[PDB]
């Protein structure tokens, strides 16, 4: 049904072959409450912890004079229920330049004991 369909896209995001990504869950104050890295750890690439840390820091870093993409997306996802960033870049510990973009959605769980939350997917370009 409608509640179940909400989970389809995020289950698919957790098993994408050929795409480097991770997912986050934020409460509605914006605080990150979980980070799912199972796709990165399965793909056996070493340096995933550094990739995730650097990607998240770039996501929350101010964009010159504008707010960070994290702020812009959080503001938009609370008002309209979905949001997306353009690409942002970061440098791994070995000097490699990478870029990423983020998409997120407000999710309304069926269980009365759970609060709404924001699911985010961060895709390496």
């Amino acid at each position: 049904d409608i509640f179940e369909a909400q989970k389809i896209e995020w289950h698919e995001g957790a098993h994408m072959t050929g795409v480097e990504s991770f997912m986050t869950k934020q409460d509605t104050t914006g605080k990150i409450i979980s980070i799912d890295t199972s796709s990165l750890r399965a793909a056996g690439r070493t340096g995933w912890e550094d990739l995730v840390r650097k990607c998240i820091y770039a996501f929350f870093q101010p964009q010159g004079r504008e707010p960070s993409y994290a702020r812009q997306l959080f503001q938009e996802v609370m008002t309209r229920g979905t949001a997306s960033s353009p690409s942002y870049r970061f440098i791994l510990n070995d000097g490699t330049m990478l870029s990423a973009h983020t998409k997120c959605k407000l999710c309304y769980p069926q269980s009365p004991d759970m609060q709404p939350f924001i699911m985010g997917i961060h895709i390496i370009d």
Binding site: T29, G30, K31, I32, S34, I35, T37, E49, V52, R53, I56, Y57, F60, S68, A70, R71, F74
Partner: peptide, 15 residues
Amino acid sequence: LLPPTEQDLLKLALY
């Protein structure tokens, strides 16, 4: 919102 602190991130990986 507040960005995660280094301890927030540490916890997110630890558990």
